Amino acid sequence: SHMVKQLKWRTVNPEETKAIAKLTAAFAKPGDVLTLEGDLGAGKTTFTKGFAEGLGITRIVFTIIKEYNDGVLPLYHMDVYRMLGLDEYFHGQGVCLVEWAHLIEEQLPQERLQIVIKRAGDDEREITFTAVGNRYEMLCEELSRHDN
Numbered sequence: 001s002h003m004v005k006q007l008k009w010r011t012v013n014p015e016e017t018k019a020i021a022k023l024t025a026a027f028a029k030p031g032d033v034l035t036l037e038g039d040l041g042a043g044k045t046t047f048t049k050g051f052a053e054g055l056g057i058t059r060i061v062f063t064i065i066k067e068y069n070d071g072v073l074p075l076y077h078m079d080v081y082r083m084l085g086l087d088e089y090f091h092g093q094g095v096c097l098v099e100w101a102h103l104i105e106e107q108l109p110q111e112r113l114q115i116v117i118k119r120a121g122d123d124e125r126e127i128t129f130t131a132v133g134n135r136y137e138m139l140c141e142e143l144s145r146h147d148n
């Protein structure tokens with residue numbers, strides 16, 4: 001392929017993972033699409049809870065789709081495990097956070113921010129952001145300048 005830009009974090013506890021998600025949500029825009037990958041127990045739900053908190057959402061954060069409009073931006077959290085018409089959400093005006101998105105690769109927009117959470121060694125996690133498209137390179141650049 002061509003080159004992709006990435007950010008990579010290491011987190012040693014779920015609060016650090018939530019903090020990264022909170023930072024990311026602060027700079028999301030309509031209609032961003034974030035895919036969220038990682039093995040069972042890696043921390044995708046944990047990430048998603050922190051993302052919702054970063055949008056100012058105060059409730060749950062699986063039912064294929066679930067929607068939140070109480071924040072600064074609507075959040076369409078999806079868990080496509082297992083296996084349409086998702087296109088209205090992807091081109092909506094909120095943020096789509098798509099867990100296990102690779103199970104519906106054929107339906108995804110070409111551009112997205114791919115988030116992968118991997119277990120590394122101890123109880124630790126490595127979270128990689130991969131920008132696919134100029135919008136998501138700009139998002140990652142904003143996150144890097146505002147690294148708390």
Ligand SMILES: Nc1ncnc2c1ncn2[C@@H]1O[C@H](COP(=O)(O)OP(=O)(O)O)[C@@H](O)[C@H]1O
Nearest residue numbers: 011012013014017040041042043044045046125
């Ligand atoms: N650095 C970390 N980031 C996220 N979760 C962590 C971390 N370290 C330990 N955990 C624990 O791993 C589990 C992740 O659960 P969950 O987010 O539901 O995983 P998934 O949604 O990927 O199946 C939780 O018990 C969480 O507290």
Ligand SMILES: [Mg+2]
Nearest residue numbers: 044045079099
């Ligand atoms: Mg999950």
